């Protein structure tokens, strides 16, 4: 199973590796190649949002109707994301101790 | 009646299903989707970002 997700940084849902953390690259000498870290232990991540009213339907032609943001009921809160602290800390620590094999 | 972080009202006018009349409708567009035109400090006549 291959899930065609779209993400720039911090790879979302997909197959994991085995044994330990693995690092892939092209040359490992120049700075122009994007280096890829494949983990072994997953880290949970959640993202939320405040409320919206509905899809306000605006008609601009014979059948061509679009949906815009309507009202907002309640207070205004900022859409945030949450990651556990110690799991991310020891995951980045494992990334560092395994990346230290290529840099003495 | 309050302060929002990144939204603007942006009420405009648009053509209905009949190619005679135009009606005023409102929305709530985000701040990165809204770009001001002209050069002056009149912060009223905004526009959509991908219409350029």
């Amino acid at each position, epitope marked *: 199973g291959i899930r065609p997700v779209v993400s720039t940084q911090l790879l979302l849902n997909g197959s994991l590796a085995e044994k330990e953390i693995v690092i892939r690259s092209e040359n490992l000498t120049n700075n122009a190649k994007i280096i890829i870290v494949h983990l072994h232990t997953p880290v949970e991540i959640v993202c*939320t949002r*405040p*409320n919206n009213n509905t899809r306000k339907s605006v008609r601009i032609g014979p059948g061509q109707t679009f949906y815009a943001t309507g009202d907002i*009921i*309640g*207070d*205004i*809160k*900022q859409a*945030h994301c949450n990651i556990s602290e110690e799991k991310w800390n020891d995951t980045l620590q494992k990334v560092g101790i395994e990346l230290q094999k290529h840099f003495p | *009646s*309050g*302060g929002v972080e990144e939204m603007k009202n942006c009420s405009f006018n648009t053509t209905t299903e009949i190619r005679d009349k135009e009606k005023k409708e409102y929305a709530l567009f985000y701040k990165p989707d809204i770009v001001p035109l002209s050069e002056t400090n009149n912060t009223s006549e905004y526009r959509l970002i991908n219409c350029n």
Partner: antibody
Amino acid sequence: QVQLVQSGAEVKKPGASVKVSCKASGYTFTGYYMHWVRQAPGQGLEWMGWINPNSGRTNYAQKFQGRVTMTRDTSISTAYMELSRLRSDDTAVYYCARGGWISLYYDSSGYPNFDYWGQGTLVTVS
Amino acid sequence: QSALTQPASVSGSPGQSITISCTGTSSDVGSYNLVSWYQQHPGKAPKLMIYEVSKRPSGVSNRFSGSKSGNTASLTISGLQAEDEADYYCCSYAGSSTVIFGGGTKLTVL
């Protein structure tokens, strides 16, 4: 210990406007909500809208839109209610209460955790 | 979208348990677990009894117990004394940032 002080009793006539002020002392009122209730003598409690003093956002209940306005004042730590077009059944007592905690991460406006209440203002008409 | 259903008045001798219940619409009480009770002494401001369906705040002894079942929220008192001559009010979050209050019960000590 924190306290909530209110204004005095008012005697008015129909077709006027009434202003009720509630002042909180002893705690940072900017990080807490403020709710309003009205009590006529004889029946139960009724709920009016809430004010967010950190941003001034209002959301009144049903059958009250357009005639009641709420305004915070962060300089002297007060909250004002201006209610216009009074009727004969508006003779009541008004209470201000402290709602939930403003967290900037989840909508905690509708939480009915009213901990501290005021003495209330007795308004009447004839 | 009226007030919550609640009986007129209750009665009971001291020394036993009295159960009060409030019923409402499924979108009001049956959907969210945000209900609470208020004790109204005649003459001054009321005081909150329990926070959530079952959550005891400080300053009140372990004597009130709250529960929810289906569309009915119940509050139980055990060991009645003479310091309960006050009204009782239910309240619930009704969605869209609006709180719906109840009718009210009066308890008498025989």
